[PDB]
Amino acid sequence: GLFGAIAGFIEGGWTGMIDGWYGYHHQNEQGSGYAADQKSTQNAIDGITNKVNSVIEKMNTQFTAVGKEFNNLERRIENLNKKVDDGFLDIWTYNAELLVLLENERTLDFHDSNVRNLYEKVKSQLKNNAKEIGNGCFEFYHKCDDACMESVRNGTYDYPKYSE
Amino acid sequence: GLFGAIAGFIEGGWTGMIDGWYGYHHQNEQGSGYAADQKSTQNAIDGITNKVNSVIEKMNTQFTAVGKEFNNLERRIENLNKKVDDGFLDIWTYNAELLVLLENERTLDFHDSNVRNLYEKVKSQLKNNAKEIGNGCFEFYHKCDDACMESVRNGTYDYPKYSE
Amino acid sequence: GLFGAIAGFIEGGWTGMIDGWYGYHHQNEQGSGYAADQKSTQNAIDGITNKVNSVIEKMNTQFTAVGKEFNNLERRIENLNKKVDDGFLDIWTYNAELLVLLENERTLDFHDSNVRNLYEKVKSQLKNNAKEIGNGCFEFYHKCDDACMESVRNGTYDYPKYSE
Amino acid sequence: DTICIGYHANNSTDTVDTVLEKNVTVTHSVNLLEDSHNGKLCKLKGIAPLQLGKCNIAGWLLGNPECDLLLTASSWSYIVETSNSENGTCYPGDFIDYEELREQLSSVSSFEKFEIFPKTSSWPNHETTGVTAACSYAGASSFYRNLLWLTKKGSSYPKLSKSYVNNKGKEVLVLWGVHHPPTGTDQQSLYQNADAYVSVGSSKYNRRFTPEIAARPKVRDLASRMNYYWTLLEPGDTITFEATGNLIAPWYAFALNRGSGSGIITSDAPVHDCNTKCQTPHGAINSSLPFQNIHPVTIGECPKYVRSTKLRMATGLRNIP
Amino acid sequence: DTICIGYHANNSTDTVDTVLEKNVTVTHSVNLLEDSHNGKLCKLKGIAPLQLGKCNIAGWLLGNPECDLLLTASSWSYIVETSNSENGTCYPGDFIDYEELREQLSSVSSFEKFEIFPKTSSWPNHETTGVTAACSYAGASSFYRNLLWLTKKGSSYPKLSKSYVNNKGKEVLVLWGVHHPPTGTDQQSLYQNADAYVSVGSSKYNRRFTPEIAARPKVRDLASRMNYYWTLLEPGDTITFEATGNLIAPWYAFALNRGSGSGIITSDAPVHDCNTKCQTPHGAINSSLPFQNIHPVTIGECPKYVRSTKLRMATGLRNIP
Amino acid sequence: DTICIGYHANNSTDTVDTVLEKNVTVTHSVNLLEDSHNGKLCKLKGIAPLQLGKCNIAGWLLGNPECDLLLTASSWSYIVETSNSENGTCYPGDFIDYEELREQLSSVSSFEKFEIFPKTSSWPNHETTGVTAACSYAGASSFYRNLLWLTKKGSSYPKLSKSYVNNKGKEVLVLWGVHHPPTGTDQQSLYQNADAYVSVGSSKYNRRFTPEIAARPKVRDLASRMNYYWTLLEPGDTITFEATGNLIAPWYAFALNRGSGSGIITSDAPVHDCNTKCQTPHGAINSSLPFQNIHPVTIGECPKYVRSTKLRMATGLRNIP
Numbered sequence A, B, C: 001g002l003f004g005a006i007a008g009f010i011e012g013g014w015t016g017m018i019d020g021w022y023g024y025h026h027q028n029e030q031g032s033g034y035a036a037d038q039k040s041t042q043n044a045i046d047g048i049t050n051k052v053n054s055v056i057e058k059m060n061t062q063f064t065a066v067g068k069e070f071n072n073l074e075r076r077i078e079n080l081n082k083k084v085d086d087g088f089l090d091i092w093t094y095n096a097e098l099l100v101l102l103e104n105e106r107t108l109d110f111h112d113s114n115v116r117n118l119y120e121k122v123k124s125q126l127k128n129n130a131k132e133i134g135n136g137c138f139e140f141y142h143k144c145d146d147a148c149m150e151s152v153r154n155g156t157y158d159y160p161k162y163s164e
Numbered sequence D, E, F: 001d002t003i004c005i006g007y008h009a010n011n012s013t014d015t016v017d018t019v020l021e022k023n024v025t026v027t028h029s030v031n032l033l034e035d036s037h038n039g040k041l042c043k044l045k046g047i048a049p050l051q052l053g054k055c056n057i058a059g060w061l062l063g064n065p066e067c068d069l070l071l072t073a074s075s076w077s078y079i080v081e082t083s084n085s086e087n088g089t090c091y092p093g094d095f096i097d098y099e100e101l102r103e104q105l106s107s108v109s110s111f112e113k114f115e116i117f118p119k120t121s122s123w124p125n126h127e128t129t130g131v132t133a134a135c136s137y138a139g140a141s142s143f144y145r146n147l148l149w150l151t152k153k154g155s156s157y158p159k160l161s162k163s164y165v166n167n168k169g170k171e172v173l174v175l176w177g178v179h180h181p182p183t184g185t186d187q188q189s190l191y192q193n194a195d196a197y198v199s200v201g202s203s204k205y206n207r208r209f210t211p212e213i214a215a216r217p218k219v220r221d222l223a224s225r226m227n228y229y230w231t232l233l234e235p236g237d238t239i240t241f242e243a244t245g246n247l248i249a250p251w252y253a254f255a256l257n258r259g260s261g262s263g264i265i266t267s268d269a270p271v272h273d274c275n276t277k278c279q280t281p282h283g284a285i286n287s288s289l290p291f292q293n294i295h296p297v298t299i300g301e302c303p304k305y306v307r308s309t310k311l312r313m314a315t316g317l318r319n320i321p
Ligand SMILES: CC(=O)N[C@@H]1[C@@H](O)[C@H](O[C@@H]2O[C@H](CO[C@]3(C(=O)O)C[C@H](O)[C@@H](NC(C)=O)[C@H]([C@H](O)[C@H](O)CO)O3)[C@H](O)[C@H](O)[C@H]2O)[C@@H](CO)O[C@H]1O
Pocket: D129, D130, D131, D132, D133, D134, D141, D149, D151, D181, D182, D186, D189, D190, D221, D222, D223, D224
């Protein structure tokens, strides 16, 4: 990964999380579960959706009859016509193949970036109130219940309350 | 943002800084003001200028008369001619649209990268002599005047001098 | 550099390291030397190899005779033919020139990313058992012998052993 | 008490290719390549194609006795020929600018056949009864339905002049023919005049035909030849036929409004009442995606043809369950 | 107290599109698309186009009487026709390989009209005075200025032989015509010989013409026709005319040096003294940018035509004031 | 004690261009552009090209006397002409549909020249010995080897009739010519018949030719002309020649199976025994890379031609020793 999160210091994905692309797993005395971050997920969905639609919709077409008929004294322009069709074929095949290869790379990088940004967003607000394990988790130095966990996910987390 | 600085942990831009793309704002007892980082700004300008020039100048142009005239027994090669022009039209429209979409994304990423590199560049030399709030700022644990502020902007800042 | 390591806070390369793209330089009481990281180097080689092969192998064409002959009452279709050859030439030259410019940029970014990812992985496991200079090195606060140096390179470095 | 940052995974086996790595398993993906078709010939622009059955376009226009006439719809968006369209010109010869004509008829509105020169009233001074075993119908020697073989009546072939004025308010396609006997004797036996000529003209069209008499192999047991010509007569314009012999005269002609930008498909695929924006010789395809590998020669608003067997775009991320 | 790292913002309302997000506001940007033109037809490579006034190229070359010469220029970078180029061949008939000639004359660095076969001295044995109401000037019957109508002198039309050697050191465009009377009586009345032919030859050119006598719909009150032919005579070569009738003879011809790669623009946009590297039928455009949406059919060194309404490249960053 | 993270460097001076920065020195790189060729004309699809030596295709087919020492294979993948191929039609005139024939012979898999109308037994009542100074060889008047100039024997040129049936099981290319004397005296002197004709016919071919007698500028001291015609005779078909004069008769013809998709290369590069997938007029090139700057005109499966002098792809990283 270009940004080093996915298959990075975060080694694997969560089948347990069904509601989004990126999210959180929390465990406290009240219970456990997976929760997807909707802000970062929906933005990613909006971005990728726009990318896909761009690749599809930017293609412009007119009504065209490709085929042409030539008699046996027209061989030269028949082959000119074939040269055109084959040239377009070489161009579109090459460009389509490379466009997909290159943009798939960028799409995976995009996800890798979003995970890292989310990770650093949480890490930034928690500060020294928690210790970073290195697998993408944080061991709290205080008690965090479901109301407290939601504050972290919501970005509304209150540092001075839990300053410990 | 891919690098998480612009519209990132740094939430907004400065209309106050008129002399560059990236830079500093300092506030001390001696006064306040905006200062653009000259090194990183000019480097970005050189890069973007090269990118724009590349897109424009790599285009090859020879003298060409596109139009052709055919009589009423020439319909087939007339439509062949039209297939060529429209095929070139489809190719250039698609590639130009996507090139601009794709490279605009990369240009914004580039700026985001430049901001983060600068942020971490300052953070690296300051170390624990200052406090990191978030938001792109640093609270000094010592007194920093305009001479000290200038050392930070040049990257010549002296760490061992201020203890604490 | 987009990722800011190469020609970044790591200012130069090692002619001394012959066995890989990325690696380590160690200094202890037992001696000094260069050692290349095999994991990150081989991953990069595999990736770049795939990229180069993609650009080359995706190009496929059919048997074609480009040249055509027309008499002096065929000037119009001769110029049509010329418009075809020159149009293909403009398209392929522009796209090839830009493909190389754009992907060379990405390849250098790729290397820059790999170095940083390697740098932060070592920083992650060392933590405060070593001090971070900012030139890409780490001064140990403990004894690091060749077995200790190898533990860092192997990623097996044990932090609690050295709290000393 | 801990909180963890992580990413989605599922049971998806979908794979994509990337510039750095082949065959990467991703959680979600979309297909950019249309690799399938419906196996049908459909309507283009809401209109069915012309089907010629046993006949090719030449047989249909000339009225080859084996072709079913008058059955043509008043409009079509394109033309379909099959492996079974064998019936052309039953009288051997050249159809001049034939490909051009096929192109010009590829799409039409307001298409109608009409009698331009009625057999009974048009030629009082010439014989209209000429037939040949080469164009047979119902066990008898016969001829094209849309043309008339004019020969001499009673040893004489007087100078003929026949005009048609186009009052139909659209273009009129006029077809005719010129007969080329193998010998000078046959020329005299049919048309009386060794010096015979045919002249055809309108405001924009002028051409003269003379018989080219040459010894030559029998085709469909005929050593003679018959060449076919056509022109598009503009609204209000007049066409005039003048001949001292050899004219195979227009009997029926065609009034039409030509469309444009269409073509001819050769396919054995069945025609149906379905609608498509893109027709291929194999069948119709969806036009939503940018690329298709079904067939390079298409008619419609079509995805670009490519050699790719697979183009698949990653949407979700690397799947690591 | 504090030092802060940040980025620029301004009042710019400029927007760009990115693959992830549409309509992103940026601080700085550049336009890659040329969406404007100057509404004029300009000089190409410092050279004005040929302007024909009331005439099309055929009328101009044949010397249609309605073509008043301003002493038409000796060179042009391309040719302009308008909705007003009406006066063509005033004597009805076909202009052979007309599209080919227009293409080959599209640019020239030198052009001169000269008298190839002087009317007064060239035809002692034939009448030169023939005119027609179909080509009229000032309310009187007239003829093409660059051709001469040869008819019989005193009941006789002897076989004529006339040659021109090209010493002009460049190509000479030679135009001529062949007249086709409506009836045999008219043929005899004009050229005396029913068996008349026209023969034209050079080193690379050989063609024979015979009269096609037929009644035809009247065009400009004429049931006859006159066909037009041409060839480009190479420097040093010779062209020879031989006729027993029906020859419409060269009077003036054109010595010229062809350029290449140009064409004809049909536009009513006004011609001006401005300069451009790229001309479109709508007007001239700046060639600096890679793309233009003004028009697909252009002449010059031109940006690639695209359908895009907007191509705008981000230079600066996201604008967040 | 210390450990350091770093990257490779070397003495490599290799440079590449990037979108942000020109001329970046990198540790490793690969070339995407094929910038070299082998300076030879090689075999395509395992088969050597046809080389015509002093002759162009017209001279080779007609048997121009300068073409006698050529040794032709039974197959070729393409055709090579050189700057030395001057020897064409030595008797001046037009070669009809010449570019088309060249295209269609560009590749052939079974080629045999055979005697279609044997000189000794075919023409008892006509003279076969006619030559011209225009086709001179070794300073002596001569003629085409593959055609025969038939003139009158004694005082008369009787009507000739000769047919050939194609038993070769493949197409037979038949070439002939038609001679056009400058004057009636010469016509009478060669063929005796002022009214002469040439007629040629097959299943697909019907034409009658008459001599066009006219004075014409001399080419190689000839005011006459000789036109060249051809047809591809299908298996089983018959071609029939009838003439009262002016026929330049087939002597040798060509049985062949036409290939497709190839063409003609004009090059002075030596033909050698070697194989390539891509041939250019400068020489053969490696087809491994996607792009080549060697030459715009190629035959084969070829890298795309580009104007680039340099396409170099970075593999390694920024080199900073
Ligand atoms: C003019 C004439 O009658 N000529 C006779 C030759 O036709 C004949 O050679 C035989 O001709 C056969 C074909 O005969 C038809 C046909 O096409 O079926 C008979 C038609 O009635 C006649 N049509 C008209 C309007 O006259 C038609 C026509 O003459 C030719 O098609 C025009 O060229 O001919 C068939 O080809 C036999 O193979 C052939 O031997 C010879 C010998 O009997 O006599 C000629 O008088």
